[PDB]
Symmetry: D3
Subunit: 169 residues, 6 copies
C-alpha cells in the first residue's frame, strides 16, 4: 500500500559465513521487526560477483584496485543472501549494519559488535575490508541488486505475527 | 542526595503483546538501576486521558496526535514500573533512545526492538509504536508517578550491588 | 486445558536484578503474563502464602520459620502466567527446588547453585530465585492471595495463534 | 572422509518463521560448531508437502488424520530450509531440537526454550503440533529429504574457520 | 563450612582459539560461583604431564589416550582459573556437562559450544576437544590447584551477591 | 608484522569483579575479533596502584583528591587484568568501553550497558567513578602500563581460528 515500504538486499559475506555469524546477523533484523522475504545460500562465481559489484561504478567512485579486491573477496566463496522487507527498510538496515569501516562502526551495530579492523590496514595489506555484511546502499541499488540474486518467484509474501505492530492492521 | 531520582516507565501495548516485558526490564537492571514499583493493567480511557493530558499534547503537537495516543493505550495491556537511581530520568531517556524507532540508535531499547517511522505513522493515522514510555523530565516524573502508583506501592530496599552505584 | 499459575521472583531474585531474566524465559516459550505487581511482603502476608499447618506437617516448624524469615519485609516480584498446562510447563522451566540439582537451561539451574545440606547447616531457607505453584489446587489458592480478580488481565499476545491455534 | 560426517535436513516451520525465530534457530547450530551448507526460503505448496511427509510413512507411523494435519500446517506457508553438516550431525541436531512435543522438550533445547504446547491440546483442536523445527529423524530420512528441498548444486563445500576444532586438521 | 570448595577449571586450547573464554566465565558467574584465581599461559610439555598423570590415564584408559591429551594441551594456550562455592566441584561438573560433546546436554557449556564424538576422536587419533576441564572430585581439585597456582595467587574477597549464596 | 598491530592493557576494576561481570566484559572483546594474550587475577596492593596511577600524571590532568580516590578504589581490592591484541586495538578498545562517565556512556558499550552513575554524584560522595573497566588511553600509556602488570613471558603468542578474517593470511 504505502510507498515507504521497501525491500533491501542483504548478504552475509564470506568472513561472516566462515565465522558462523549468519544467525547472529539474521536475529538483529528479526528483532527490530523487519521481515525476511527471501533467502539463499550459495558459492558466488566470478560472473555473479561481477554483476553485483559493477566495474564501471566501483572504478568511477574508487579504483580498479578496490574492485579487484571486492571480486577476490567474494568470488568462489560462500555467502548467505537475503531480502528484508519493511517500513523504510533500506535506511534502517543501513542503521543496523553500522559504518562501512568496522574500526569506526558503533557498538550495538552488526559491524560494531562482530568486527573491528580498519581501512588503513586493509589498504596496507591489499585486501577488501571484511565487514561481515553488505546492504543495499539506497533505493536504486536495491532495485538493481535484488533481481541479480533472486528470481521474482523467490520473493515471498506472508505476514509476521507482529505485523500489526509495525504496519498497523 | 538531591541527585537520586525516580522515573516512570511503561511497556506500551506493543511491547506487551510482543512479549518484550522481560527484555525491557533487564536493560534497566543490567546498568544498575533499581525497580521500585511495578504493576500490570488494562488502561481505561479515563486513565489514558490523565497520562496524556489533552491541553499539554495539543499545545506541543495537535488533537490528531493526542487522539491516536489515547486510541493506542486505551483498553490495552501495559506494564508500568518505577526506576530509581542517580540521575535516573536522564539515564532512562538515554537507554530508550529517540522517540522515533527509525532513528533510535542500535543499543537502545527502541533501536533494538522497533524500527518504523513518524512519516509512516502520520500517513496511516496511528501513533508511533515505540515499545516504551519514560518520563521526559523531573516535573513529568512527579506528575506521572502518582497517576499510576499509590505512595504505598513504591518500594524501599537495597539491591545487592548498591555499594557500586550509590556507594556505602 | 488453559491454566493460570502463580509465580514470584523471590527476594534473592529481586536483590540480584534478575526480574527481567526470569520474565523473559516465560515470554520466550510463548507463555502470557496476565498479572504483575511488586511489593514488600509483611509477616501477615508471608504467613498466608506459607501455611503453618501445611509446612509443619510436610517438613517442620524450623523450615516454615526460615521461609517466613526469607520473605517477610523483603521485596518480591509476583506475576501470573497463563497458557496450556502452564503449571507443569512453569515447573519445567524453573527446574528442581534445589539449585545444586537444578538442570542447566532452567531458571534455577542457570541463576543459582547452593544446596539443601548447606542451608540446613546455616539455618536459612533455600534461596532459589523463584516460586511457582506446585499444582492446580495450590494455584487456585495462591493467586487470590496475591491478586484481586480485577488485577487479572484478558488480552491477546501477537503469537497466540502459534500456541492456542486460533 | 570419515563415514561419520553427516548432513541433515532442517526446516524452520511456519510457526518459527511467523514468530521471527530463524536467526535464533540457526545460531544454536552455528554455536556448537555445526556447519550450514545450504539454505532457502519458500512457500511450500501441497505437492512439496506431500513429498516431504510421505503418505505411507506417516500413516504407518501414525494415522491419515495426522498426515492431513502435517500437510495442512505447512502448505501455502513459508519455511526456512537448510542443511547442516558435521560429525554425527543427525543425532546432534535431534539433541539440539529436543522432544517432538514442546511441553516435554527439556529447557535449553530449541523446542524447550521457544515453545510449550502439547499433543493433548493439538489433538483436541484438530491441528498438527507447532514445534518450531523439523530435523531428519535418521540417516535414511536425511538421504531422502535433502534432494527434496535442494538440488546438488545448492549444497556448499567450504571450511568454517573453526574446522580444525571439530574435524581436526 | 566443609561444604565450601575450590575447583580447578581450564578453558582448553579449542575454547581459547575459538574465542570462548568470556562465554565460559559468564556461565559460572551467572549462577553465583566466584572466580578466585585466573591465569593465561602456553602450557609446556612438563606442566601438561603433571596435570594429566601417566599412571592415572594409562590405568583407566590407555597410553594412546594419554599421548593424545598431552599433544592437545602442550605448547598450546589455555585459560586456567579457580572457582569457589558451596559444593562447587559437583556444581561445576553439572554446568560443564558430559565429557563427550555429542552427548552433552543443551544448556551446558559442552552442550552449547561443542558437539563431536569419541567415536570420531578415536577414529582420527586425537583427544576429544571438549572446551573445558574441571576437577572431577575433591581429591583431584586438591591435587590440580597447586599445580597451576601458588597459594598467594588465590584471592580472598566478597562477591556483591555473597549473602544470596553463602548467607550473611 | 604491520606497525598497526597493537597491544592494550585492560582491567576489570573491583566493581566489575565484585559484580560478576568479568565474563561479559571479555566477551565484548572476543566477539569483535580481538585476541586475549595475557590474563591474571590479583589483589592490588597500594604499591602497585601508585605505579599504575602515577601521582604526577593524574595530579596535572585532574587533581590530588581524584588521585586519592583512585588509589582507595583499587588498593587491597580484586582486579582481573588482561591484554588485548589486534589491529589498532587501543582505539578500538576505547570505542568498545565507551565514555569515562557511565551516565554519558552510549548504550552498546561496556560502560553504557553495565553502569550508569555520574561524575557529579561521585564528586559529591568523595569517591572515584565506578566504571567497570580500565583501558590504556594511547600507544604511550599502553607501553608504560603493560610491563607493570605483566612480565614479558606472560604475553602469549598464538593464532585465533578467525585470524584470517582480521589479520588476513
Amino acid at each position: 500500500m504505502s510507498m515507504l515500504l521497501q525491500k533491501t538486499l542483504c548478504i552475509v559475506k564470506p568472513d561472516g559465513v566462515r565465522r558462523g555469524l549468519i544467525g547472529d546477523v539474521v536475529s538483529r533484523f528479526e528483532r527490530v521487526g523487519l521481515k525476511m522475504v527471501a533467502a539463499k545460500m550459495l558459492i558466488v562465481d566470478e560472473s555473479l560477483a561481477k554483476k553485483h559489484y559493477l566495474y564501471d561504478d566501483i572504478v568511477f567512485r574508487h579504483s580498479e584496485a578496490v574492485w579487484n579486491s571486492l571480486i577476490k573477496f567474494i568470488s568462489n566463496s560462500p555467502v548467505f543472501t537475503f531480502v528484508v522487507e519493511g517500513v523504510e527498510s533500506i535506511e534502517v538496515v543501513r542503521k543496523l549494519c553500522g559504518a562501512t569501516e568496522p574500526k569506526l562502526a558503533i557498538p550495538g551495530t552488526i559491524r560494531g559488535d562482530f568486527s573491528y579492523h580498519s581501512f588503513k590496514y586493509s589498504n596496507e595489506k591489499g585486501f577488501s575490508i571484511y565487514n561481515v555484511i553488505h546492504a543495499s546502499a539506497n533505493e536504486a541499488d536495491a532495485m538493481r541488486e535484488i533481481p541479480i540474486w533472486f528470481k521474482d518467484n523467490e520473493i515471498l509474501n506472508y505476514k509476521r505475527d507482529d505485523e500489526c505492530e509495525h504496519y498497523y492492521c
